């Protein structure tokens, strides 16, 4: 059975400007780095960075819709949005969904998301105001 | 403050064979459906299927590095694999590089792992057993 994300690996076309972004920028804790990656977390998310050749920086119009988006607080969120954009890290998509989002890029592309909010409060939601054809279990 | 990941969001090109995948093979649970997504959880991790036409069922061979592990115990670890294999399940590699880990596809391509271990334990795995040119903070 299983029993949660256990990590996300993001490939990175340049090791240095994503410890960066994710270390310094993005805040998150930065635990070992090696010649191809590194190894950082996020509260309970283990992030890698792999260093990977075939990674292009892909414009957000050249790629689907995954994305990451990791937890904030409502009262963190506005200044958490303003160091981004202070940053000139582009933003992909504008909110207009439950709960506050900030949707912005990485250095390659990675599709990224600020978001204020659980399934749990995602459901309550739409339960109230259910999305066409949605059926719950 | 980031505090881990809120949710992680899969596009897919096919919403009734990707929720049979992460539902029936890999037995997340399914909380809603609609036309054009669902909702699933394994474990805390929230996951989103949202369907895209911009997703193409993609060769492991063109896509970079980046994937997505999910957590099993070492109990369960080598049944459940064999199970995915016997099922007919993609995979994309073969080599341990980091740990006990078997590596899979999704209907779409999407890069999936199975691993046992924290990051704790990779840490500690790695000091014996480092990657070139590892340094732990
Ligand atoms: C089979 N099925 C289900 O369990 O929930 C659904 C919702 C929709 N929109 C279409 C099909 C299903
Ligand atoms: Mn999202
Ligand atoms: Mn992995």
Chains 1, 2 share one sequence.
Not at 22 to 29: A, D, K, N, P
Not at 35 to 60: E, F, I, M, N
Not at 112 to 133: I, M, N, T
Request: contains cysteine; glycine residues 6%.
């Amino acid at each position: 059975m299983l029993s949660g994300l256990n990590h996300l690996t993001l490939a990175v076309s340049q090791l240095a400007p994503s410890v960066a972004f994710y270390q310094q920028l993005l805040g998150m804790t930065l635990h070992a780095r090696w010649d191809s990656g590194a190894y950082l977390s996020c509260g309970d998310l283990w992030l890698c960075l792999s260093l990977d050749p075939q990674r292009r920086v892909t414009p957000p119009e050249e790629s689907d819709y995954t994305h990451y988006a990791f937890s904030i607080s409502e009262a963190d969120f506005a200044s958490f949005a303003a160091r981004l954009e202070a940053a000139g890290v582009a933003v992909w998509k504008l909110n207009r969904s439950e709960g506050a989002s900030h949707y912005f890029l990485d250095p390659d592309g990675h599709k990224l998301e600020l978001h204020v909010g659980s399934l749990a409060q995602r459901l309550a939601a739409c339960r109230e105001q259910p999305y066409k054809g949605m059926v719950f279990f």
